[PDB]
Design a protein around this nucleic acid. Sequence first.
DNA 1: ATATGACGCT
DNA 2: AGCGTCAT
Length: 426
Amino acid sequence: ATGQDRVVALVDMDCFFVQVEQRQNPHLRNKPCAVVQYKSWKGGGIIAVSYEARAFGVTRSMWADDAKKLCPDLLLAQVRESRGKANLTKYREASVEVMEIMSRFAVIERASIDEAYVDLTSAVQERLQKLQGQPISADLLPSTYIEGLPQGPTVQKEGMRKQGLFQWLDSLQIDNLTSPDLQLTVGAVIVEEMRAAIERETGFQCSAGISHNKVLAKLACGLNKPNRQTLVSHGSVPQLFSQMPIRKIRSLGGKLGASVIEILGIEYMGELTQFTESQLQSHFGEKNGSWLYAMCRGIEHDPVKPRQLPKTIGCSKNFPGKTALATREQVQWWLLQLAQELEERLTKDRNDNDRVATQLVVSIRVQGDKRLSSLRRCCALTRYDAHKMSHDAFTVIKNCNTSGIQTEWSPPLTMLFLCATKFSAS
DNA sequence: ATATGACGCT
DNA sequence: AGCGTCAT
Ligand SMILES: Cc1cn([C@H]2C[C@H](O)[C@@H](COP(=O)(O)NP(=O)(O)OP(=O)(O)O)O2)c(=O)[nH]c1=O
Ligand SMILES: [Mg+2]
């Protein structure tokens, strides 16, 4: 394998929600502006920021009323609200558009709402003998950088770009249809044309990674951004990882990586390499001394599971602070309220994808519990009717109340998560 | 007081 | 089945 079988990409839309609202209300174009959920408490919570607005310091998970103190001429599109919660239809609609476009090129896996990994390996082959040995001109990759290039014997940003591109193509071996670096270059032209096509047909710009496995392609994606792609070649990796902080590797963002530093005593992805696959396992998993040991050597094998369609549909809403729920009548209302948008989507799912969910998950968080899901009770799901799901998901949870008046509810709930899983082909 | 989906482990 | 972890 040597971390060079597949050709894998990760496309990712640049401030996805913001572009969607930027394409709708065009005054928002080329202006610093963010998108917000809810309006009462301090102007709303941010979730997405145009890059002209990150220039002032505006981050997500920040109060719109605070980021207005960071940015003065910062515009504000609010996410459509329905039944007192977030109605993200707009963006899922935009999402299905871009994935229809991408799917035309290679088998893709829907990563997030705005991300898709692509398995270009099967495609790069069906082109290398379908062009004889074409020189592969620079004009075909007008948005690609080559991480780790150019080497060296008054440049601006695009000056430096051309340079590394021509260094790539110069040592290119358009003859060796086997060389791994050459196929990288092929998948990249494809991603150039994929990326060029999405803009052509949605107006949405995005950024890509092109490399040999899921992980490199993601880290590659975020390097040059926005409206750019990076081709982290197998040879880039020792330079790229030498100073890459370990937490920037997908899967290493959470606890595992946190302890990886605290146990091994390091900070960068390169520092992780001075250990045996045996040695690492004793400090971590039997699967994690392994996975790490290949990763820090630029090798990963988790395949692009081709799947453009989520396995689960779910509606969630938080009740933070003094807005937690403490009434039998209050919990019941929202569970219906949640069940009402859930029906809507499930029917949208039925007549779109020809499938139907079978089990319902009801989940709640509690004021106090150091947990997202303090409870998660998985039940049955026949007909797509809210009142049925409403009452049934309630009767699931009614027996963890500890108020001795049954009109009230305690400890109050911070979250209701209604989630439909197990879609059968009917 | 920063709405969602994927998966792993038991 | 039901928790815990990771992610956008
Ligand atoms: C991380 C995150 C994202 N989102 C929404 C908003 C994003 O616009 C959209 C994709 O999130 P992203 O890919 O992490 N960031 P972005 O697409 O807005 O900006 P960029 O990719 O860094 O250019 O999903 C949430 O609603 N809650 C969250 O916690
Ligand atoms: Mg994005």
